[PDB]
Curated annotation (Swiss-Prot):
Phosphorylation by CK2 disrupt the intramolecular binding between the bromo domain 2 and the NPS region and promotes binding between the NPS and the BID regions, leading to activate the protein and promote binding to acetylated histones. In absence of phosphorylation, BRD4 does not localize to p53/TP53 target gene promoters, phosphorylation promoting recruitment to p53/TP53 target promoters. It is linked to Cornelia de Lange syndrome 6: A form of Cornelia de Lange syndrome, a clinically heterogeneous developmental disorder associated with malformations affecting multiple systems. It is characterized by facial dysmorphisms, abnormal hands and feet, growth delay, cognitive retardation, hirsutism, gastroesophageal dysfunction and cardiac, ophthalmologic and genitourinary anomalies. CDLS6 inheritance is autosomal dominant. A chromosomal aberration involving BRD4 is found in a rare, aggressive, and lethal carcinoma arising in midline organs of young people. Translocation t(15;19)(q14;p13) with NUTM1 which produces a BRD4-NUTM1 fusion protein. The record marks 99 as: Acetylated histone binding. The gene is BRD4. Belongs to the BET family. The chain holds residues 42 to 167 of 1362 of the full protein. This is Bromodomain-containing protein 4. Residues 17-123 form the Bromo domain. Coiled coil: none annotated. Ubiquitously expressed. JQ1, a thieno-triazolo-1,4-diazepine derivative, and I-BET, a benzodiazepine derivative, have been tested on tumors with success. Treatment with GSK1210151A (I-BET151, a I-BET derivative) has strong effets on mixed lineage leukemia and promotes myeloid differentiation and leukemia stem-cell depletion. The lineage of its organism: Eukaryota, Metazoa, Chordata, Craniata, Vertebrata.
């Protein structure tokens, strides 16, 4: 079995822009989630080969993880904070779609997401 190629993190044709909101997403949001004790399953793409989950990529067609998000923030992939926010939301929603409610992995995604939303409430203007 095989894993797909990861989501794009470099593309010279895509316009990029630093915003103070993006900077906050990296400095504060990502940094804080990354260190949480339930971050580890979300720090890289789901390795469905290693995990013996051969249907994962038949079910989840827009994969996303905090590894990818960290690369997209550190090498400036985004034009705005909403694109980055959508990546986080995709990662969470994928977990809730693939797994069952009350699964441990779901409880872990849920704790991250709660923290994510708290941090998003302090997103600076502009
Ligand atoms: C994240 C994620 N979403 O769906 C799956 C499957 C994973 C995932 C990623 C790495 C990963 O190691 N797992 C196994 C695991 C981790 C914590 C608790 C229970 C099971 C699962």
């Amino acid at each position: 079995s095989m894993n797909p190629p990861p989501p794009e993190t470099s593309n010279p044709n895509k316009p990029k822009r630093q915003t103070n909101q993006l900077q906050y997403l990296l400095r504060v949001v990502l940094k804080t989630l990354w260190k949480h004790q339930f971050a580890w399953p979300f720090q890289q793409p789901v390795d469905a080969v290693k995990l013996n989950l051969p249907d994962y990529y038949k079910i989840i067609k827009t994969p996303m993880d905090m590894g990818t998000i960290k690369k997209r923030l550190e090498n400036n992939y985004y034009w705005n904070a909403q694109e980055c926010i959508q990546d986080f939301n995709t990662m969470f929603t994928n977990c809730y779609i693939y797994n069952k409610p009350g699964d441990d992995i779901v409880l872990m995604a849920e704790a991250l997401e709660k923290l994510f939303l708290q941090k998003i409430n302090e997103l600076p203007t502009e």
